[PDB]
Structures are given as C-alpha cells and as structure tokens.
Write a protein that holds these residues in place. Structure first.
Motif, PDB file in Angstrom:
ATOM      1  N   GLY A   1       0.783  -1.222   0.000  1.00  0.00           N
ATOM      2  CA  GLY A   1       0.000   0.000   0.000  1.00  0.00           C
ATOM      3  C   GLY A   1       0.818   1.276   0.000  1.00  0.00           C
ATOM      4  O   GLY A   1       1.636   1.504   0.890  1.00  0.00           O
ATOM      5  N   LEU A   2       0.591   2.115  -1.003  1.00  0.00           N
ATOM      6  CA  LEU A   2       1.269   3.401  -1.091  1.00  0.00           C
ATOM      7  C   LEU A   2       0.331   4.440  -1.674  1.00  0.00           C
ATOM      8  O   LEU A   2      -0.320   4.190  -2.682  1.00  0.00           O
TER       9      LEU A   2
ATOM     10  N   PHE B   1       2.793  10.992   2.742  1.00  0.00           N
ATOM     11  CA  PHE B   1       2.385   9.790   2.032  1.00  0.00           C
ATOM     12  C   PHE B   1       1.962   8.736   3.038  1.00  0.00           C
ATOM     13  O   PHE B   1       2.284   8.833   4.213  1.00  0.00           O
ATOM     14  N   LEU B   2       1.227   7.739   2.568  1.00  0.00           N
ATOM     15  CA  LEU B   2       0.659   6.725   3.442  1.00  0.00           C
ATOM     16  C   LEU B   2       1.084   5.357   2.943  1.00  0.00           C
ATOM     17  O   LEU B   2       1.013   5.078   1.745  1.00  0.00           O
ATOM     18  N   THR B   3       1.548   4.517   3.862  1.00  0.00           N
ATOM     19  CA  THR B   3       1.844   3.124   3.546  1.00  0.00           C
ATOM     20  C   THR B   3       0.980   2.224   4.416  1.00  0.00           C
ATOM     21  O   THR B   3       0.644   2.572   5.548  1.00  0.00           O
ATOM     22  N   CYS B   4       0.606   1.071   3.877  1.00  0.00           N
ATOM     23  CA  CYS B   4      -0.207   0.117   4.617  1.00  0.00           C
ATOM     24  C   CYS B   4       0.124  -1.289   4.142  1.00  0.00           C
ATOM     25  O   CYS B   4       0.189  -1.541   2.940  1.00  0.00           O
ATOM     26  N   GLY B   5       0.349  -2.199   5.087  1.00  0.00           N
ATOM     27  CA  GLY B   5       0.825  -3.530   4.750  1.00  0.00           C
ATOM     28  C   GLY B   5       0.093  -4.662   5.440  1.00  0.00           C
ATOM     29  O   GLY B   5      -0.909  -4.447   6.121  1.00  0.00           O
TER      30      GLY B   5
ATOM     31  N   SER C   1      -3.832  -1.634  -0.151  1.00  0.00           N
ATOM     32  CA  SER C   1      -3.832  -0.453  -1.010  1.00  0.00           C
ATOM     33  C   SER C   1      -4.447   0.771  -0.343  1.00  0.00           C
ATOM     34  O   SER C   1      -5.162   0.662   0.651  1.00  0.00           O
ATOM     35  N   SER C   2      -4.165   1.944  -0.895  1.00  0.00           N
ATOM     36  CA  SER C   2      -4.783   3.159  -0.387  1.00  0.00           C
ATOM     37  C   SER C   2      -4.767   4.308  -1.392  1.00  0.00           C
ATOM     38  O   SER C   2      -4.159   4.214  -2.462  1.00  0.00           O
TER      39      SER C   2
ATOM     40  N   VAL D   1       5.202   2.238  -6.361  1.00  0.00           N
ATOM     41  CA  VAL D   1       6.031   3.393  -6.639  1.00  0.00           C
ATOM     42  C   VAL D   1       5.143   4.601  -6.919  1.00  0.00           C
ATOM     43  O   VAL D   1       4.089   4.476  -7.541  1.00  0.00           O
ATOM     44  N   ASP D   2       5.561   5.768  -6.443  1.00  0.00           N
ATOM     45  CA  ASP D   2       4.740   6.959  -6.567  1.00  0.00           C
ATOM     46  C   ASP D   2       5.545   8.212  -6.239  1.00  0.00           C
ATOM     47  O   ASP D   2       6.272   8.242  -5.253  1.00  0.00           O
ATOM     48  N   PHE D   3       5.405   9.244  -7.070  1.00  0.00           N
ATOM     49  CA  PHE D   3       6.066  10.529  -6.842  1.00  0.00           C
ATOM     50  C   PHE D   3       5.312  11.376  -5.823  1.00  0.00           C
ATOM     51  O   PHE D   3       4.083  11.360  -5.780  1.00  0.00           O
ATOM     52  N   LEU D   4       6.044  12.137  -5.014  1.00  0.00           N
ATOM     53  CA  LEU D   4       5.401  13.115  -4.143  1.00  0.00           C
ATOM     54  C   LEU D   4       4.811  14.236  -4.985  1.00  0.00           C
ATOM     55  O   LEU D   4       5.163  14.400  -6.152  1.00  0.00           O
TER      56      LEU D   4
END
Length: 640
Positions: free
Chosen positions: A373-374, A383-387, A414-415, A615-618
C-alpha cells in the motif's frame, strides 16, 4: 517476440510471454509512429535519500553507533548510516540481496557485511559473500569468499586484539561453516564445520586474536586458531542446566566470556576455561537476546520476552532496570551511544534512543510484514503506507517520521488520498475498506465490497467518485461528497476475466482505465458503471495518472521477453516528463515520459531486496517513494 505496429488500426501490440496485448495510440500519433524509433533517457536521475524501517524481527547483532554520530544498521540490501542529530542518512548499497550480518572494525571506521544468496532477473543463484568497506568514502575495500560461503553469511566479526587484521564468518551451510580470513589480503586462514544447528553469534576474544567464541541452539564452543586449523572446546555448563539456546555473547574487561541464553541466565565463563565461573540465575523472565559491555565496565542486558533493560556492575550485581513500552515489542539489539545514550532495536523494527533510566523514543521504524500500500498526498509532502502487518502509516516526508499510525483489523493492501487531502482510503485483503481523517485519524466510514483482495483505491481527480479494484474481477464505484466524507454505492464495473491490478482516471473524471491478471486493457464510465468498448473514443483520452503498466504511453518500460508479473507498479511524475517502475527483481527504474518505444533506456536503482511492490512521486516531484513488499522497507528517492 518483438512488438508489432498497425498503421491501419493505430496500435502497437506487445507480447507478454505468448499472448499479445493490444494498445491503442492517439490519432495524432499514428501518422508518424515508427516502431524502430528510440525513446531517450530521462533528463533527471534518482538518489536514495531515506530508508524507512529496521530489520530487527528476524536478525540480531545489527545495530551500532559510530563515533561520528551515525547510527548504523541494515534492512533489505542497504546498510544505513543515520545521523539522528543532523537528521541525515548515508547508504552503502554494495550488496545485491538481503544483508544479514554486520561488524565494525576496531578502527571504528572499517565496516564488514554479509549477505544471503541471491536469485537474479534470469535468474540463477548469486552466491552469498562478505564485503569490507569504508564508512567514510563508502568505497568497497574487499570482497571475500565469493564462491566459498553457502546459503547466507549469518555471523561476522573483526578480531579486536591485533587491530582487527582478521575476520570470522559463519554461513548457513546446514553444516554452518565457520571461517577466518585476513580480510586485507582476501585470504582464508582456516575453516571448520562450526555446528549443524543454527549458530547466532561468533566473536573474537578482546585480548587474544586466536580465539573465536560461537553460540546458538544447544551450542557454546570455544575455537582456537592454530595456524590453519580451528580447535573446538565445548562449553561445560556442569552445574548449570544447559539452556535451549545460547542467544548472545560478549566479554568482560578481565577477559571472561559472558553469555545470555534462552533461560534468562547471564553466564560468566572464566578466561581460559570452558566452564562456568559465575551465573546470574534468572536475570530475565524470558530469553536474553542482547548483551552490551559499555565503555565504563557496565554490562547491559536486553530481554526478549520481558522487555527489560538491565544494567549490571563489573561484578554482575543488579545496578538499574527499565522496561521498554510494550508497543515497541521485545528487545533484540543494544548499542552504546555517546554519553548516557543507549540504543535499542526491537522485534517490531523500531530503533529507540533512550537511556538506562530511561526515556525511550523511536528514531526509526517501519513495517514488519509484506508491504503493497502506497498513496501520495495531493498538496502536502506526506504519504501513506499500509501492509499485511495491519498498520496504516501516515508519513511526513520532510521530517521522515510518521504523522500517525493506525492499526486496523485486517491486513492492508492499497490506499488513496482524496484530492482535498482531508481523508485517506485504505483497502484490505478481505474486501473491506476504510476511510480515515487525514488530520485526526478518526474513522470516517467502513464498507465491504466482495470478499477478495482490494488491490487499488483511487478517488477521481474531482473527488466526486471512489474507484475500488478487487481481485474478484470487479471495480466497485462509489459517489463521494462533502470532501471525501460521504459515500454512496453507485454500482459495479464488471467485464474483466481476472483480478484487477491497476486503475487510472481521466483528467476530466469521466473515464477509467483497467489492467487485470488477464493482461487486458478495459475502459469504463464509472458514473454509469458501464464499459466503453469503442476504440475511437478511448484512444485519444488524456489520463490523470499513469499507474497502469499496460498502456501505449507506458509500454516499453517492459523488457523484452518480460512476463506479465515482472512489473508490479508504474507511475508518472506530476509535472516532469518521467516514469518510474518497480520490478520483481528489486529494481526501481526511471524512464522519460512518454515511454512509447520498444526497449526504452532507463536508470536502474537498487536497494530493495525482493519485489518493489509500489512506486509513486510526491506531489511536487521532489521525491519518489518505493515500497519493498517482503523486504519490509520504504525507500525515499529524491529527484535530481
């Protein structure tokens, strides 16, 4: 084989394994599209700036504090040198898979690290090896026993008497071979089957370079280095009942071997002997995983189960005691800081900084399980992570610390943020999803759609709809109002033959793209929950984001002969013309955008141990954020 171009139909067909996937280009592009054309390298590059998480859960003896003020540990394939005071990280990435052990030379500057065996993108087996490098220049100094070690190098240590001219290591050969080296000459002095069970430590005697002590499952041996042979002398507990495990070892100023074990017993072994001379009986309720001889003679004791951090005198009498907040979990490693500073690494992947008294606060932390999750904040640098560890964490990307950490009922996958930035959505493996308040962390709503995994959670650019991807092969649509705070099920997009892998909204919030396990590209009008099948209409659509790995603007990030599952994630920068991917080989790539020609060039960046899952850009393209999946880590790359 190679992809094919269709002038008559305006598409390129790429091939995943056997099946071809048909990708339509815009009409204005068909006239002069050249199949043989090349796409350039991106104008920008990436530079690792930060790694989140510490590998404590399944590792020991991997926390040190250099006299420079840098806390040293590892995680995934990266060694981190973290200067808490400057809030800066430096990294040594010499390894090509999971780091498993780390020792610091008596010189306080020269480091040594071990590694598991690899498996590459081919993939054959890359043998486990040891690397000796400089912590100052981060230059590799030597590479030891490349073909010798098997499975992984689990233990390592410099001899401290002579000036650390020697090094010992222990692989996981199932015979667990112990070897000694003159590291500066890359020569093996000797070796011998150290044990046939797990061995957890190996260390040189402070005053005699010819003695190595190793410990582990029903095992405490004293090895003597005679020329090119190792002589074993087993530990004779005698009056003490032998513990299930001997967890750790260290040494007193007077040259005694000190031992922590499964039973919670600190055992002192007399210099020269193989027998117990002193014994702190039941120093800990549970097992003892960490021992640390402070500079001043104090021995510090770390309890796994009991979470107690005990201070002992030179004569082994209880001096002081503290308990670590149970939120952090059981202690795993302890390292001496400057002054009254103490560092602890826990089984939950926290690195705490406190004191023997002692006020322990985290200075590092991360997930403890597989992470997928990103999600990036639309306007803030968060940013947010979730696992699978059931944590949803809201990170500050400038402070490099959590803003908050929600623990939910089910493993998260996911988020997505609402374009307003007021709420954030989180999907789980159960089919249940949540919305939380960005500011307060308060729950906003819960819903269950399907009973399978929710792979994707994305609001439309206008924030008027929520699109939810499910492994049941459907895409659930909700209407969103009151700035992400009110929801109502619009219906379901159905037509995919397989689980949903990726979704993208169009700039005008009207359309949605889809990727699936089938490797088919479907289109949708979410508001109407109906599929748009007509090419001429969808081919010229302009999309808000590019997290679909299967598409004309993005294909070509795929390597020839690629397999559908080789790339977990793709994304476009918000303003800059860059694409980034995470592959199943631990690599993050930077491409230019668009990437619409076969065999696109890319900058490749290593660090993650296994699968880069996301993967994701700020929001300002200041950074790229990757998730490591099983390697547990989050890595923050700055765009340069």
């Amino acid at each position: 084989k190679e992809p094919v171009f269709s002038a008559e139909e305006g598409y390129v067909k790429m091939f995943l394994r056997g099946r071809p996937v048909t990708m339509y280009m815009p009409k204005d592009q068909v006239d002069s599209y050249s199949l043989e054309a090349k796409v350039e390298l991106p104008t920008k590059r990436l530079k690792l700036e930060w790694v989140y998480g510490y590998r404590g859960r399944d590792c020991r003896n991997n926390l040190y504090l250099l006299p420079t003020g840098e806390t040293v540990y590892f995680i995934a394939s990266v060694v981190v040198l973290y200067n808490v005071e400057e809030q800066l990280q430096r990294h040594y990435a010499g390894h090509n898979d999971d780091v498993k052990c780390l020792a610091v030379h008596p010189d306080r500057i020269t480091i040594a690290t071990g590694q598991v065996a690899g498996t590459s993108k081919d993939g054959k087996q890359l043998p486990p090896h040891v690397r000796i490098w400089d912590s100052v220049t981060l230059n590799t100094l030597h590479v030891i026993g490349i073909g010798f070690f098997d499975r992984a190098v689990t233990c390592i240590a410099f001899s401290k008497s002579n000036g650390g001219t020697n090094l010992c290591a222990v692989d996981d050969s199932n015979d667990h071979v112990l070897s000694v080296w003159d590291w500066q000459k890359e020569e093996k002095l000797a070796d011998v089957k150290c044990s046939n069970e797990a061995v957890f430590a190996a260390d040189f005697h402070p005053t005699d370079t010819n003695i190595i002590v190793t410990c582990g499952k029903s095992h405490l041996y004293f090895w003597t280095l005679e020329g090119s042979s190792l002589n074993k002398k087993q530990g004779l507990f005698e009056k003490q009942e032998k513990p299930k495990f001997v967890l750790c070892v260290t040494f007193s100023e007077n040259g005694d071997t000190i031992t922590g074990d499964s039973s919670g017993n600190i055992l002192v072994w007399g210099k020269g002997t193989n027998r117990i001379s002193y014994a702190v009986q039941g120093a800990h309720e549970g097992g003892i995983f960490a021992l640390c001889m402070l500079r001043d003679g104090t021995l510090v004791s770390g309890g796994g189960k009991d979470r107690k951090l005990i201070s002992w005198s030179g004569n082994y009498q209880k001096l002081r005691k503290t308990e670590i907040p149970e939120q952090f979990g059981p202690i795993r490693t302890v390292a001496e800081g400057k002054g009254d500073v103490i560092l602890i690494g826990t089984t939950r992947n926290f690195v705490l900084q406190g004191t023997l008294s002692g006020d322990f606060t985290p200075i590092t932390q991360g997930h403890t399980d597989e992470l997928w999750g990103l999600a990036i904040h639309a306007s803030k640098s968060q940013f947010l992570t979730c696992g699978h560890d059931k944590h949803a964490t809201l990170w500050d990307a400038v402070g490099h610390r959590p803003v908050w950490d929600k623990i939910i009922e089910d493993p998260a996958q996911s988020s997505g943020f609402h374009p307003s930035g007021s709420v954030v959505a989180v999907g789980t493996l159960t089919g249940r999803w949540f919305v939380f308040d960005t500011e307060t962390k308060d729950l906003v709503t819960v819903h269950t759609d399907g009973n399978e995994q929710l792979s994707v959670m994305r609001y439309s650019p206008d924030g008027n709809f929520l699109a939810i991807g499910s492994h049941d092969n459907c895409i659930y649509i909700y209407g969103v109002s009151d700035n992400g705070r009110k929801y109502t099920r619009v219906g379901k997009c159905s037509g995919h033959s397989s689980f949903i892998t990726h979704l993208d909204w169009s700039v005008n919030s009207q359309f949605l793209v889809s990727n699936s396990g089938d490797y088919e590209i479907l289109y949708w009008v979410p508001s109407a929950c109906k599929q748009v099948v007509s090419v001429e209409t969808t081919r010229d659509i302009e999309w808000a984001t590019y997290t679909c790995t299967l598409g004309f603007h993005v294909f070509g990030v795929w390597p020839e002969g690629s397999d559908g599952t080789d790339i977990n994630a793709v994304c476009r920068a918000h303003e800059k013309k860059l694409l980034s991917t995470g592959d199943d080989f631990g690599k993050v790539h930077l491409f230019s955008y668009p990437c619409s020609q076969f065999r696109a060039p890319s900058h490749i960046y290593g660090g993650h141990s296994s699968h880069v899952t996301n993967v994701d850009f700020l929001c300002e393209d200041s950074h790229l954020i990757s998730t490591g999946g099983k390697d547990t880590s989050i890595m923050q790359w700055r765009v340069i």
